[model samples]
Target: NVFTAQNTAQDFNGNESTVKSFYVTRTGKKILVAITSTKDNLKTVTCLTTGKTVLNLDPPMRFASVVYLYFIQNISSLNRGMVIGHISET
Candidate 1:
């Protein structure tokens, strides 16, 4: 299954925005991140596999950043799981 999150911006057009989706592994171990946009205004998406990191970028920055990480050992059941981590500003 996939989990979706809606993100609406006011300045852009009605059709211009981003919708994020989070997917879990079959055994409920890892998570997959995806983003869909009505307009073609995105830069790049980054993922941190080791430790927590901060995103210091300017506003009006059109990009979708989805991070996926695995926690559990088994990923064949397709169960829902959550990723726990910490983020700090530099």
Candidate 2:
């Protein structure tokens, strides 16, 4: 089973936007992140549990977490991006 964490359309105004902190209310194994942007941009994923920061752009990223929270940041200019995240239940 899978549960969605962040699924929404976002607007970029030459700066950065942050997604609401995703809390794992249910027991999960890992997180799947899918992102698409209109232009070149930088994406950041901050893990509050282990103090680790994952960085990537315009691709799919995943990490292990069952009791961790995450913060997402997007930096795109004059374009839009769509972010989708899901938690896997194993």
lDDT of each: 0.32, 0.35
- What clash count goes with each model? 5, 0
- 1-90, model 1: which lDDT tens digit per residue? 444443322222333334342344456543433333443433332223376321221122132343322222232332322311111110
37: Cα error in model 2, Å: 7.6
Tens digits of lDDT, candidate 2, 1-90: 323343323333335544433333324544333332232343444333465545434433434321323234343321222122232321
* lDDT for 55 (candidate 2): 44
The stretch of ten residues in a row with the least summed lDDT in candidate 2 is 76-85
TM-score of 2: 0.30
Error of 2 at 59 (Å): 5.5
Candidate 2 off by > 4 Å: 6-15, 20-28, 35-40, 59-90
